[model samples]
Target: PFERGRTLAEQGDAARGIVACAGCHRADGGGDEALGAARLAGLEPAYLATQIERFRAGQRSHPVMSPWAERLTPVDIAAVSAYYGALAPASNARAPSDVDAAAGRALAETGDWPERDLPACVRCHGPGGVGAGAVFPPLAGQPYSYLLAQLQAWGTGRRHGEPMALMGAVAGRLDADEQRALAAYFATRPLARAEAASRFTPPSRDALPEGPLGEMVRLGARLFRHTNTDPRSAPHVGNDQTCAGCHLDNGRRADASPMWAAWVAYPAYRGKNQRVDTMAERIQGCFRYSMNAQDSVSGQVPETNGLVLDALQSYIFWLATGAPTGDTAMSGRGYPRLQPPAEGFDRTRGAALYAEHCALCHGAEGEGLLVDGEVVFPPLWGPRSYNWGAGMHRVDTAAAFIAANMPLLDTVRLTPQEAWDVAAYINAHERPQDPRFDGSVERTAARFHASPFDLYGEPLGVDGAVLGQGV
Candidate 1:
C-alpha cells in the first residue's frame, strides 16, 4: 500500500500533471506559512476525510488548489489523502503575530468602541480569541497586523472562508481604529491548543486586472522581504533591521503605529513641516528615520528610496480596502486633524479659507444640511459624524483634518500650511447642528467651541475655547 502511494505521488505521469502534495504542503508535508498551508495528520481522520470530499465536490476555493483537485484521479486523491492522514500529528502550525500591533487586539477584544459596531473578538472567537465550532479559527497569538488586515479583508471580501462569508461582511466594514485595535490586541495572545499546525492565511480575492500591475504586486511581496549584505539595501541589514523585523507578521505594541500606515493620508502637517505632506513625501521621511540608510543603497548604487514605495503602498492599499481615505489606523492625542491653533492663529484669515474650501460641503454657518425642503448634500459636522472626542479641533490638530480632505470635492491637492489653515477654519465652526463651536455670544468665545469636551460644565460664555489646541 505504501509503495503504491509513493508511486502515485512520484509517478511524473503526464496525464496526471497533478502537482504533488509536496508542491504546497512541502515534500515532507510540512506546510508553508506565507501560503497559510497547514499540516496534515494531526486532525481526526474523520475531519480530514470530510475536507477531501469537499475539495472533490468543489466545496473549496483557491486559484491553485481548485484547479488541482479537478485534475486528480479517484485513486490518486484517496491514496495521498490517506497517506498523510495515517501519519502522526506534526505540531508545526502557529498563528503569525506582529510585534508592533498590540493595539489591534485591544480593539477586537475591548468593548470601548466609539462606533462601527465592532464586537469583541471573544464574542466570536470564544473568550480566548480562538475561533469556535467550525469556520472561525483560533486567533490566539496570531500576528496582530495581519489579523487586523485579515478582518478588513474579510469585511471587504478580499479573503473569504466558506463559513466566513458573513463574518467578512462584518469585519470588512470596521473602521481604522477597530482594525488596528483588534490587530494589536490579538497578536500578543497565546495560541489555542492544536494537535496540528497551520501557518499560512489564504489570500483574498483581488480584482487585479490580468496584467503587469497584478504581477508587480506579487513580485513586490517577495522583494519586500529580500535582503543582502550590501549593508545599504532597501531593508538594509543594518541594526539587523527588516520591515517585518520591527513590525512583525502579527501585532506590534498597541500604541506603536505601522510603517506603512498613514501612507495614503498625507500632505499632512508634521510639526516639522508646519504644513501638509503627501504619501510619497511621508515615505521618504520614514526611510530617513526608520531605515537610517541613505537613499543610495550601496556606494555606487542609485537611490532605492522609492523602490519600496510601490510594494509598501500596495500593502497599505490592501490593508485599507474598507478604511475611509482620511482615517488613521491609530489614535493620537485624539483623531488626526489639520487645524491651526487659536492662540496665535488668525481667525479672519481662517474664515476666508474655510469659506473657500470648506463651506460647500459644510455650508455657511457650518449648517451642513439645509432642509431645502429636499434631501441635501452630506454634512461635515454632526453627532452623526465622527464622535465629539475626535481630534478635529485646533488648526494644527485639524490640519490633519484638512490635510487629506481639502480643496473641496478633490481631496488631493493641498500644501501643508493650506491644509492647516483650512483645518483651522472649518474646525472652528460649530457642527451646525451643535452650538459648541458656533460663535454664539453666549458661548465661551472660541475657546471650547470645537473642543471635544462638552463645555456645558463651564459657563456658556465666550472664554471656553482654550482646550487642548497644542499646548
Candidate 2:
C-alpha cells in the first residue's frame, strides 16, 4: 500500500536535489494523511521548509514526517521539495473561515495591536506571507498546533537558524504575556493559498538627524571616553571627568564595581527602590552619586531633554548591537542597600577630629596630603576618590567603616562614634556626588537634601533621610 506512494514522494528529490522522503506516504508515491505526509507537489516552497523544520525538531508529533526528517540534512530537506512547490498555484490556495478574525490575524501578521509595540508579522512573514518568500517560510495556516509549537520553539531557542534568530529577537520583545496570544492567532487560521509576497523588504533609509550617525557615534565615543561628565564633586574627586578617567575601556572596573551592563538591560524590578525601572533610570542614578549630575527622564531639557541623552543613547545603541539588549540574568541588586545615617555623628565635631587626626595624611585642605612631592601619603578630595561598594557614600556608614580601619598613626585605636564624627565632617566638605544629573530623578532631584555626608558621613540614597550616630 505504501510502496507506490513512497516512490512518488521521493520523485521531486532527483529534480531539486532534495534528500527527503518527508512525512508519511505509501509505495504509490501518494500521501498517507494518517501518518501526516503532506502531498509533495502542491505546497508552498517556504511553507514546506518550515514544516520540514518543525517535523525534524519533533515539534509535530507524527510518525512518518517526523522520523523521516532526521534522515535528511537540514538544508537539503528544506529545499528538496522546492521544485514541486514551484508547480503549486496560488489560485488554488485557501484562506481562513472567519474573515472577522482579521483583527486578531493582523496581530499575528503585524505588531499593530494596541500596547503591543510589535511590528506586523507580515514585516517578517512577508506581505500576505507566501512563506517568508522563500527565505522566511510561510505563516498562513499550517496545522494550528504546529504553528504555535514554532513560536514556543523560539522561546526555547529550538527554532534557531539564520532569519529564525531574528524572529527570536522579535519574540523576546513581546515578553511572555504576548506570546500566547500571538501563537494562538496564527495557528488556527485556514491555510491560505500561497500568494506571492516579498519576505525581505529593502533595508530602511538611514538618518543621522544629529549629523552623520557615524559622526554622532564617533562624538559619542569621545564623550563616553572623555565627555558627558555630570557637573559636581564625588566622594573621591575634587574635579570632574566623565567615564573616561577611570573606566579605561569605557567599562574597565579596576575598582571592581558592577555597573558595566548598566546600559542595554534594566527596567528591572529593583527591590531597594521597590519598583521596576529601566536602564535610563539606572544611568541617571549612577550619575547623581559618581559624576554629580541631575536627571531628565522627561526629555524636557532646555532642548528635547537635551542632546546629552539623545546622542549618548544613539552611541550606546550602536555599541550594543551585537550584545544582548536585555539580559534577564542581571537582577540589578549588585550595589548594597544604603541604610540611613545616625543622629550625632556630628559633622561639626567630625571636622575637629579630622584636623587633629586625618589632616596630616589626607592634607589640611583634604586635597590629598603629598609626601616628598612624589608619593601622595594620602590622596584626598581629588579625581581618584572611590567608593567601598562594600561601604562608603554615607557618613554613618563610613564612620562604622573607620571604626574598623582608621587612626593612620595607630591603625586600630579609633572609637566607634569618634570615627563616625570624623567621617561625617570629611564628607561634609562636598555635597553628594554629581548634581547636573541626580539619578534620573528629574523631579525628585528637588526632594533630595544635599549629601547628608557632612552630617551623617555618608551620601545617603536619594531620599536624604538618615539617623544620627549619637541619637
Candidate 3:
C-alpha cells in the first residue's frame, strides 16, 4: 500500500516514468511559491480523487499535470490521492505581492471592469471565494503564487477547461493589479464546509444581427479577438501580442487604451507626431511600438486600406457604435496625464528604485524572463520589450503608468518622483533599433528631438556616447 506511495509522493518512480508530487505540491503537500501549483492535501477525498481522474481523462487538463496524470495507473492515483487527502492543508502560502484586502473584497463582490464581461468569483465560487463544489475547488488560504499563475495561465492559453474561452478572456482582460487583487482576496477565505451549492455555468456568447452589416460586425469581432490566428491578418500581425492584449474586452475596457474613446476623436492632434493623425496613423504607430512589430512591418507602415488594416478599423468602429464624436477629450483615453514634479526627475534616484523594487521581478539587466520561449514576465527593455519609439519611452507617460500601476499588488508604495525616476531608468537602457534610425544616431537624434524628455538620440555622457547610440 505504501511502496510507491511514499516514493511517488515524496520521490518518484523513474523506471515507471512517474514524477514526484513533492516537486510540484511539495513533500508535505504544501505547494511551492515560485511554481504556483495548488496545495495537494486538505481537500475533500472526493475532490482529490475527482481531479486525479479528471486529469487522467480528457475532462480537465494542464500542460505539466496532464503529462503526470498520463503516467499513473488507477492504483497509483488512489494511493497518491489517499496519501495527500489525509494530510492537513497548510495555511501559509507565498503571496506574490502585498494586496489591499479591502480592494480584494470589492473586486470579489463587484468587478471593476464590467466591460470586459468577466465574472466575479463570488458569482460561482460562492461566498468568500470558497469552493462552491468540487468543480471549482477551494481558493481560500491557497498560495498567492498559485492563484496568480493559474489566472495568467488561463489568460495566455496555457491552461484549458470546459470554459477555457471564458477564463481566457476574463484573465486576459485583467491588468496586473486586478489579477493580483483577485488572487490575494480569494486566498484569504476559508475552505468549503459543505458540498458546492452552485457550480459554474459559462456566460453565453454576445449576439449579432443578420445580413451583410451583421456579417461584417461578426468578422470584426473575430479579427479583434484572434488577429494573429485569423488567416486574413496573421501574416501582417507578427508577434504573440494581439489587439486584445492591450485593449481588453474587445477594446471596450477603460483600464487600458480603449478603442471607442479613440474612435470618435480621429484626425485629432498628436503632440508626439505634432500633427493631426487619423485612426490608421494611430494603428500604424501601435504596430511599431505596442505590438513590438519586429518583422517585415517592424518600422514601416502597413497599407491603409489593406486587409488587416480595414478589419481592425471596422472592428473598432463597431465597438464605438454609440461613442461620442468630434470631442478630443477623454480622461481615460491614453495613459494618465500626470503633472510634472516641482523638482525635476532624477535618473540617479531612478536607478536605485529600479534596483530595490523592480529588479526582483523584471531582472537587473532589464532582460525579461522567458520560460520555454514564452515570456513569463515581459522584458522592460531590450529586443523583446516595446521599442524606443513607444509612448512608454516618454518619462512623463511611463511614470504615470507606473505610479497608478506598478509593483503589481503593491502599486501605491512609490512616490510620484520615484515613479518618474524608475520610468526614466527603464527608458535609459538600450532597446531595440529605433524604427527611425538612418545609419547614424546623431542624425536620428537631431531629426527627432522634440524637447529632450526622451533619450532616443540624446547623449547621457556616460562616457561621451549618445544616449541612443554608442551604448
- Per the 3 Å backbone cut-off, how many clashing residue pairs does candidate 2 have? 73
Candidate 1, 1-471: lDDT as tens digits: 445445544453466576566666655544455565555433333444455556666554456556766776667666666676566433233334433455454545433222333345553454455434333444555444336545665665555544324466466556776566565556446543011321112123245425765665544444333322222243332122234322322111111133334543555776644667766565444344333333223312223354556655565455434434555543321223433434444456767866765564456565443221111222344322222223333345456535543432232356666665555555543331222234343353344333332332223223755322210
Model 2 is weakest, by summed lDDT over 10 consecutive residues, at 193-202
Note the Cα lDDT for every prediction shown. 0.44, 0.44, 0.65
Summing lDDT over every window of 10 consecutive residues in candidate 1, give the lowest-scoring window.
Answer: 193-202
**Model 2 lDDT tens row, 1-471:** 133233335553455453435433333223332332333444556666676776666544445345556655655554555644644332211223433344455456435322323446654454453343344555444433344455676666665654324566565556443554554454444444001321111111133235577776655555554443222112212223344333322331212122334454566787635688765555444444444333223222212244555555555566444334566433321222234435556767877877867664456766652211221233334333322111244565566545543442122356766776777666544333333333443223334323534332233423554322111
Candidate 3 lDDT, tens digit per residue, 199-254? 11111124444577567766766766565456665555544445653454456555
Q: Is candidate 2 or candidate 3 better by TM-score?
A: 3
lDDT score for residue 106 of model 2? 44
* Model 3 stretches with alpha carbons more than 4 Å out: 1-234, 237-250, 271-275, 292-294, 297-300, 355-361, 369-376, 407-413, 461-464
In candidate 1, stretches whose alpha carbon ends up further than 4 angstroms from where it belongs are 1-15, 27-30, 34-61, 73-99, 111-114, 127-131, 140-153, 158-164, 175-471
Each candidate's number of clashing pairs is 84, 73, 4
The CA lDDT at 102 in model 3 is 54
Best by TM-score: 3
